[PDB]
Amino acid sequence: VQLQQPGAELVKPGASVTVSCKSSGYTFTSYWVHWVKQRPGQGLEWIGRIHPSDSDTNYNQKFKGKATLTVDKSSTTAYIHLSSLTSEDSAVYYCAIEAITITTDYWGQGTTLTVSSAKTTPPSVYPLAPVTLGCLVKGYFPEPVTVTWNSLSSGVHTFPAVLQSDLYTLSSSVTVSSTWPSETVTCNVAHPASSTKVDKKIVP
Amino acid sequence: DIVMTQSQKFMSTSVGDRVSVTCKASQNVGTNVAWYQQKPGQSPKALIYSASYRYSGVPDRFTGSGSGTDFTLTISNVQSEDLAEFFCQQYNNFPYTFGGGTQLEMKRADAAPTVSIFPPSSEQLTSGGASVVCFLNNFYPKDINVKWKIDGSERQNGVLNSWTDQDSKDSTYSMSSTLTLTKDEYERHNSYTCEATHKTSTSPIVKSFNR
């Protein structure tokens, strides 16, 4: 079972947006689809639920005029539509279902929605060489970016972004003495909003 | 609406001990209470439904209990891998409401940071910018201080600091400090030093380079 959500969405204030939740691996019309909103400092909020069989819905009254739940049975996809967007709607939106055969939950990756008047800006990627290596991702907007080391997982420290002059900047450190050089260590970083992917090899 | 009170936002523990996260509902919700775990960078994961029943694959180390208004999530033999924020939730009445969340904190032996300094990349200099990055990796406890020095003179402006979550593998913390100057200013100087002050050493840990 998989719930596929777009990684990010950047919308201007006052506009609207539709986030998709593409499901696979089970009978789409069997289980309620729930939606959850998450912002820092506010924890988790329940938006509502929809049953794809007949589009029966229960809404959190807080989101009555803001969120609209729909489904497309033939494409096994659920949608949430958000109207009159403000910065208050900037958050991560999850879709989730509960399968019973043994109860198991399945969640999407969450869509990071940013409501801002700023334009998309791709990240400038810089290699950090003197063994601990690094990758500097500077001047991107909006969040998020996904960085990966070739793949390498242990000895990886990806630090949270910091907003400097209206752009975001973060760094990642990979700690792998003999391995480098000879073993090509490459910074892999994607900015889903700018549709910009960069590869930068760490060279001495 | 129903308010779910998680009175503790943080709970400290050592590996192998027992922790109990309390959750108090403002109304009778029976046993229609769920518990969730959100590890860093991950979506929430359901651990407990019906107050005490575990989802598939959830270990018996996670025990849910309570009924009515008082609810408790007990974690036995807590591992650093369990590091996450824990949310209770009621689904007895619309709308479903979550608790405020409780972050797990692991206590461990004190550790000194692994400090690494990096000169500005050749690519960034061919753009008029110049950033000097210092990594302070895998230390404990979290309290640490970084001092930048240029030709022996302390520099406080233009410094960007960032801290990671507690590492779920070794319960350590990490910090990156980035000193950003213009290209002309960076070539006006030679010595660039990053100093780290931590309780593990009376003297700072120094890393530097000459351009």
Side-chain angles (χ1 to χ4, degrees), chain A residues 25-106:
Chain A
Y26 72 103
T27 294
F28 180 54
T29 56
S30 279
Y31 308 129
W32 291 92
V33 180
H34 300 247
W35 292 86
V36 171
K37 174 190 194 180
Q38 173 162 43
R39 330 152 65 188
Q42 305 307 126
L44 303 170
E45 289 182 280
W46 187 74
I47 305 167
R49 66 177 193 172
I50 184 160
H51 207 292
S53 58
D54 50 18
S55 290
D56 198 14
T57 54
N58 298 108
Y59 285 101
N60 190 337
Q61 198 224 287
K62 166 165 176 166
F63 295 96
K64 264 288 200 181
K66 169 83 48 193
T68 305
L69 303 182
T70 53
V71 294
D72 184 327
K73 296 148 83 34
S74 72
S75 69
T76 66
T77 298
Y79 306 90
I80 179 165
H81 179 84
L82 305 167
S83 66
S84 344
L85 291 158
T86 76
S87 63
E88 238 155 74
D89 305 307
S90 300
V92 174
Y93 291 88
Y94 301 100
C95 64
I97 69 147
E98 203 183 65
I100 298 172
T101 165
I102 142 136
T103 296
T104 315
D105 64 325
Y106 298 100

Side-chain angles (χ1 to χ4, degrees), chain B residues 5-30:
Chain B
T5 294
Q6 285 178 256
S7 66
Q8 312 303 123
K9 288 182 45 152
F10 302 94
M11 299 193 84
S12 42
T13 186
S14 297
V15 169
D17 298 342
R18 172 169 289 101
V19 298
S20 279
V21 188
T22 65
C23 175
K24 301 170 304 249
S26 68
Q27 273 164 73
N28 178 21
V29 291

Side-chain angles (χ1 to χ4, degrees), chain A residues 13-118 120-163 165-196 198-202:
Chain A
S16 80
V17 76
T18 301
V19 189
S20 55
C21 175
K22 177 177 184 265
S23 84
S24 64
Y26 72 103
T27 294
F28 180 54
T29 56
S30 279
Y31 308 129
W32 291 92
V33 180
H34 300 247
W35 292 86
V36 171
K37 174 190 194 180
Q38 173 162 43
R39 330 152 65 188
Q42 305 307 126
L44 303 170
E45 289 182 280
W46 187 74
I47 305 167
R49 66 177 193 172
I50 184 160
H51 207 292
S53 58
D54 50 18
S55 290
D56 198 14
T57 54
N58 298 108
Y59 285 101
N60 190 337
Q61 198 224 287
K62 166 165 176 166
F63 295 96
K64 264 288 200 181
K66 169 83 48 193
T68 305
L69 303 182
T70 53
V71 294
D72 184 327
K73 296 148 83 34
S74 72
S75 69
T76 66
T77 298
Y79 306 90
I80 179 165
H81 179 84
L82 305 167
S83 66
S84 344
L85 291 158
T86 76
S87 63
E88 238 155 74
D89 305 307
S90 300
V92 174
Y93 291 88
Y94 301 100
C95 64
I97 69 147
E98 203 183 65
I100 298 172
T101 165
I102 142 136
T103 296
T104 315
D105 64 325
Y106 298 100
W107 296 69
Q109 93 186 308
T111 303
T112 301
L113 170 74
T114 292
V115 179
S116 165
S117 309
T120 337
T121 307
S124 297
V125 199
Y126 300 129
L128 297 173
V131 50
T132 285
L133 306 162
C135 192
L136 165 78
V137 192
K138 169 186 213 67
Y140 71 93
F141 180 87
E143 284 262 62
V145 290
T146 283
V147 317
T148 48
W149 283 114
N150 284 134
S151 114
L152 281 304
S153 120
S154 217
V156 179
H157 287 311
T158 317
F159 299 84
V162 181
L163 185 64
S165 283
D166 318 306
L167 297 325
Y168 284 105
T169 288
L170 78 85
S171 269
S172 179
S173 64
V174 59
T175 291
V176 282
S177 34
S178 69
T179 314
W180 188 76
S182 84
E183 208 290 324
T184 280
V185 160
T186 305
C187 183
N188 299 122
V189 41
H191 191 218
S194 219
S195 75
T196 289
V198 187
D199 309 301
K200 281 287 216 302
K201 203 187 330 164
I202 314 302

Side-chain angles (χ1 to χ4, degrees), chain A residues 155-157 173 175, chain B residues 108 111-114 136-140 164 167 170 172-175:
Chain A
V156 179
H157 287 311
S173 64
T175 291
Chain B
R108 46 148 302 142
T114 298
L136 288 58
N137 285 350
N138 299 85
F139 60 91
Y140 186 90
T164 46
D167 197 291
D170 57 17
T172 61
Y173 298 86
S174 292
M175 158 183 225

